[PDB]
Every structure is written in structure tokens, then in C-alpha cells.
Amino acid sequence: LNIDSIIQRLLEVRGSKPGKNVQLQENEIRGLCLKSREIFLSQPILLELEAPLKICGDIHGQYYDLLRLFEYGGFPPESNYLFLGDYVDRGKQSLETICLLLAYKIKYPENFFLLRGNHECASINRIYGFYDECKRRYNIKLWKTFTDCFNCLPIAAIVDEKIFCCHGGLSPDLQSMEQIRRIMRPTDVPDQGLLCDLLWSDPDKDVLGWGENDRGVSFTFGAEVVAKFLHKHDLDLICRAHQVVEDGYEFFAKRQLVTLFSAPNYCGEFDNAGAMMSVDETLMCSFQILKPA
């Protein structure tokens, strides 16, 4: 598996017009999936990271925007990265997107991190795009290999014991960090329960406690759930993605939670910007805005 050749080929499309594909050999892609899976399983399901690091929200196959993110934040290993999930579906180039991210994870396993989003699930990416892309450019077996890889992704992370990071949000069933640590991999996402909530919930300013989620699954949570959560676990901030917000990021409950979305002009219809959060050693935050290009 020649990782450097793969990364160089994927980056060659830089400074080009969005849409240009990178056609890697099938065995290479299969290789990235099997190699990265091995690494995912050797690292905790609940990551313990240290700043400085850049945190990114949803990408959704918008490969040319991912390149722009690395451009503004610095290509690995110049900066440590933590992605919050949702690399595939919706966008037209999920393959290049996930391949580049997997290649970086393989080359810099200790300085590059990827969490699971609700779209890194076979039943979801079967509907929203990834499956069609895989079938059109390669074949179904390749999609199945991607599924095996996805089922081994870590679920959450905690930066310097103070910043909790997950894709969707909190769960009424989450009473101890121990619960997340005991989830065994490989695994798929259940239709309810802790694992489901961590990938599917959203914060709601108008709810008291727990509420129904319009996505048709999981719950919504209020500002008080956040405050209580942070306090009992002695954390300072909750960082998540999952929800498209017009400015790329949005603070919730007096800056106790931040939502990050890194795909500008999502689905080609919303006119939202994308954002990336930088956390330094003192844990002070800075946000880079990516205007839709």
C-alpha cells in the first residue's frame, strides 16, 4: 500500500475546477479501508486528545471544500485534526473525500482523528448517495468493505479533559463515560439507545429537558441538560456537528455547546458558510469561516 502515492494523487486536483475526479485503483481503496480499520480498533472508542487541534464538522462528499479546509488550517502534519463525522452522502465526491481522510489517518495515526457520524452507517448511506457513487464508479463489494471500516470508527472524544466531542449530541441514557467505553466494535447503529443518540440528537432552545426530534429518531435536548451534563462531568464545552447552521457554527446555552458544519452551500441549496474551530494549548477558541465558493 503506497500511501504517499495515494495522497499525492488525491491532492493533485488542488487548484482545479470542482468535479474533477481522482480514480484510484480498486485494490488501493480496499487497502485503505482494511488498514484504517486495523488502526481504529487499536485506539479507544472514546478518544482522549490534547490540544492544539483543529476540529471540523460535516463534510458530506464536498471534496473541493475539504481541500480548502486543509488549505486554511494547514495540511497534516502541520496541524492535528479531529473530524466529527459525516464524510459521505449528499455531496458528489464522497470517495475522494473519505479516501483522503483515511489515507491521512493511516499516515499520521496519532495526529489525525475521525469520529463516526450518523452517515457512516450502511442503512443511511445506502439512501443518501454513497452507495450510488460506489456502484457507479466501482461496485457494491467496495461499498460493503467501506461498511466494515465504518463500523469500527470511534464514537466520541474528550480534549484535555474539558471538551466533549461527538457527532450528534447527548443521550438521556448517558450517565457515565464508562457506558461509551464499553460499546463494542465492530457495530452498526441501533434505531434507539445511547449509540443512536450520540449520532442523532440535536439541541433545542425551546425545549425543557428532553424532546422529540423532527428527524424521526432520537431526541432534542434543552440548555439545562447541557449545563447539568457539563457540571457533573467537570467539562467546559460540548462540541458537535450534525446540524446545518447558516454561519458554519453556532453557540448554544451561553457558549456551553458549539455546533460545527464544514460544508458550505450544503446540498447546493442552503447558502450556509462552513467553519473550522481551532483550540490552542490554553483551550481558547478561534473560528475560521469558509464562504461558499
Ligand SMILES: [Mn+2]
Ligand atoms: Mn449527521
Ligand SMILES: [Mn+2]
Ligand atoms: Mn450531516
